[PDB]
C-alpha cells in the first residue's frame, strides 16, 4: 500500500531554515511527479511545489519561489523540501502527495509534519485523569490523560496502542500562557477497567518525547 511519512518539523526561528523529508513506500517513486502541499492554521490549503521523475522540471508559487527548494532521491525513495528565510506565514502542516497516472494531483497524502516559525520548544507533563466522584454510575467508566504545557503543536494520543478508538474523545489544545494543553478521554465498560488495563500513548514529536502511561486506581 502506498505510504508517505513526513520527517523534520518542529520549531524554526524566523529567518531560519529547515529541511523536511518524505520517505515513500508502496509504489515506484521514480515514475511520478511528487508534491508538497501545506495547510495553514486556518485549515487553508496551499500547493507548495512539484518535481518531475528526473528532478529537472519544477515549479513553486510566488509565496515560496526562491526560498523553498524541493529535491528528490530515487535511490532512497525520498522527497525533500529545503526551506530558507522562513517567515511566520510559513507555519503549517506539510504534506507530500502523489498524483494519478490518469490525471489527478493529490491522490495519496502523507501523514503530515508541522513546521512552526517563532520562539522556544518544551515537552508536556503527562498526568492521569481518574474518577473521584462516587456518583451512581455503572456500565461506563471514563478515564483520560492530561498533557500539560508543551510547545509547539502537535501531540498524538493513542489508547492501548491504537486498540481503543471508539470511545476516544480528544479536545482541542487550548493555548495557555504561551503553551498548549489538551485532554484525551476514553470511555470503557465498567467490566473492563480496572480489570483490563488501559494505557495512554502520548507523543510530542518536536522534542522526540514519547511515553505510555497506565491509568490505575487512585
Amino acid at each position: 500500500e502506498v505510504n508517505l511519512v513526513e520527517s523534520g518539523g518542529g520549531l524554526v526561528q524566523p529567518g531560519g531554515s529547515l529541511k523536511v523529508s518524505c520517505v515513500t513506500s508502496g509504489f515506484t517513486f521514480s515514475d511520478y511527479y511528487m508534491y508538497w502541499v501545506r495547510q495553514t492554521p486556518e485549515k487553508r490549503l496551499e500547493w507548495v511545489a512539484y518535481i518531475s521523475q528526473g528532478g529537472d522540471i519544477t515549479d513553486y508559487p510566488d509565496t515560496v519561489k526562491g526560498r523553498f527548494t524541493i529535491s528528490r532521491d530515487n535511490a532512497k525513495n525520498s522527497l525533500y523540501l529545503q526551506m530558507s528565510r522562513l517567515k511566520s506565514e510559513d507555519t503549517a502542516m506539510y504534506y507530500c502527495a502523489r498524483g494519478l497516472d490518469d490525471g489527478a494531483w493529490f491522490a495519496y497524502w502523507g501523514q503530515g509534519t508541522l513546521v512552526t516559525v517563532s520562539v522556544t520548544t518544551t515537552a508536556p507533563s503527562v498526568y492521569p485523569l481518574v474518577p473521584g466522584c462516587s456518583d451512581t454510575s455503572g456500565s461506563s467508566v471514563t478515564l483520560g490523560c492530561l498533557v500539560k504545557g508543551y510547545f509547539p503543536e502537535p501531540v498524538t494520543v493513542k489508547w492501548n496502542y491504537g486498540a481503543l478508538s471508539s470511545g476516544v474523545r480528544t479536545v482541542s489544545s487550548v493555548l495557555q500562557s504561551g503553551f498548549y494543553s489538551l485532554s484525551s478521554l476514553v470511555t470503557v465498560p465498567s467490566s473492563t477497567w480496572p480489570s483490563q488495563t488501559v494505557i495512554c500513548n502520548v507523543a510530542h514529536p518536536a522534542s522526540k518525547t514519547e511515553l505510555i502511561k497506565r491509568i490505575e486506581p487512585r
Binding site: 495547510q39 485549515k43 487553508r44 490549503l45 496551499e46 500547493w47 515549479d59 508559487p61 510566488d62 504534506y95 494519478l100 490518469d102 490525471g103 489527478a104 494531483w105 493529490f106 491522490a107 497524502w109 502523507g110 501523514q111 503530515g112 507533563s125 498526568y127 492521569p128 485523569l129 481518574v130 474518577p131 473521584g132 466522584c133 456518583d135 461506563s140 471514563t142 483520560g144 492530561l146 500539560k148 474523545r169 480528544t170 479536545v171 482541542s172 489544545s173 487550548v174 495557555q176 494543553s181 489538551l182 485532554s183 478521554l185 470511555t187 487512585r218
Partner: protein
C-alpha cells in the same frame, strides 16, 4: 493565478439529506483542452485531506456512489445524494489547469441531529501533578448536542472562578455529538485550602443544572 470560490462557507445539513457545494473559478480553466483539472477534497477531523473527485466527475477509487461531481466552464458542483454521518468535514476544490494551482476556500459540513444531553464527570487532581507545583481539576461533559453548553465552577460554593479554560471536541463522524471539557487551574496550596469543587453544566436539553462534585479530604 485563478482564484477559486466556494459556496457556502458553512453547510449545516441533516442525515439522509441531499447536499450541494459549489465551486466557481475566476475564469474558465481548461488546460491542454483534455478536460479540466478540477477536483474535490474532503478532510475529516484529525485526518489528512482525501481525493474524492478529479477530472470534474471522475470518482477516485474507493469513493462511495453518493458522491457526485459536475460542472463546466467556471461553475462546478458536488452533490452528496444522501448525507451519511461519516461525511462531516471540510470540502475543497482544486484547480490544476493553470499555474499556480489553486485550492478553494473550503466549505464546512455540519450534521444537524436531535438534541442529546451531556454526561458530566469530575476529575480530582493527581498526586503526580501536585508535586509539579500546581493542581488542575477538570470537568468533562460528554456526548451532547448542540455544541452550546455552559460550565460554572464553584469553590465551596462561596464563589466561581476566572482561571478556567474551556475547549470542545470535533463533531463525531458517526455519532454527531460534541464533547467538551472545562479545566480549572489552581496552585497546589490554594487547592489544599478548600473542601468541595463543583461543576454546573447548564445545557438546553435540561432545565436543571447538571452538578458534579468532590470534597478533597476524608479522615
Amino acid at each position: 493565478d485563478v482564484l477559486m470560490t466556494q459556496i457556502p462557507v458553512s453547510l449545516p445539513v441533516s442525515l439522509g439529506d441531499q447536499a450541494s457545494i459549489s465551486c466557481r473559478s475566476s475564469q474558465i480553466i481548461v488546460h491542454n483542452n483534455g478536460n479540466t483539472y478540477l477536483e474535490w477534497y474532503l478532510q475529516k477531523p484529525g485526518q489528512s485531506p482525501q481525493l474524492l473527485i478529479y477530472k470534474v466527475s471522475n470518482r477516485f477509487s474507493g469513493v462511495p456512489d453518493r458522491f457526485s461531481g459536475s460542472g463546466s466552464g467556471t461553475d462546478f458542483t458536488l452533490k452528496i445524494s444522501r448525507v451519511e454521518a461519516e461525511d462531516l468535514g471540510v470540502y475543497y476544490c482544486f484547480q490544476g489547469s493553470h499555474v499556480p494551482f489553486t485550492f478553494g476556500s473550503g466549505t464546512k459540513l455540519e450534521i444537524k441531529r436531535a438534541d442529546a444531553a451531556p454526561t458530566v464527570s469530575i476529575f480530582p487532581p493527581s498526586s503526580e501533578q501536585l508535586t509539579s507545583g500546581g493542581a488542575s481539576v477538570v470537568c468533562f461533559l460528554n456526548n451532547f448536542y448542540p455544541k452550546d453548553i455552559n460550565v460554572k465552577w464553584k469553590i465551596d460554593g462561596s464563589e466561581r472562578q476566572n482561571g478556567v479554560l474551556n475547549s470542545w471536541t470535533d463533531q463525531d463522524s458517526k455519532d454527531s455529538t460534541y464533547s467538551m471539557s472545562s479545566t480549572l487551574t489552581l496552585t497546589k496550596d490554594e487547592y489544599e485550602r478548600h473542601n468541595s469543587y463543583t461543576c454546573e453544566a447548564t445545557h438546553k436539553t435540561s432545565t436543571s443544572p447538571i452538578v458534579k462534585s468532590f470534597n478533597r479530604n476524608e479522615c
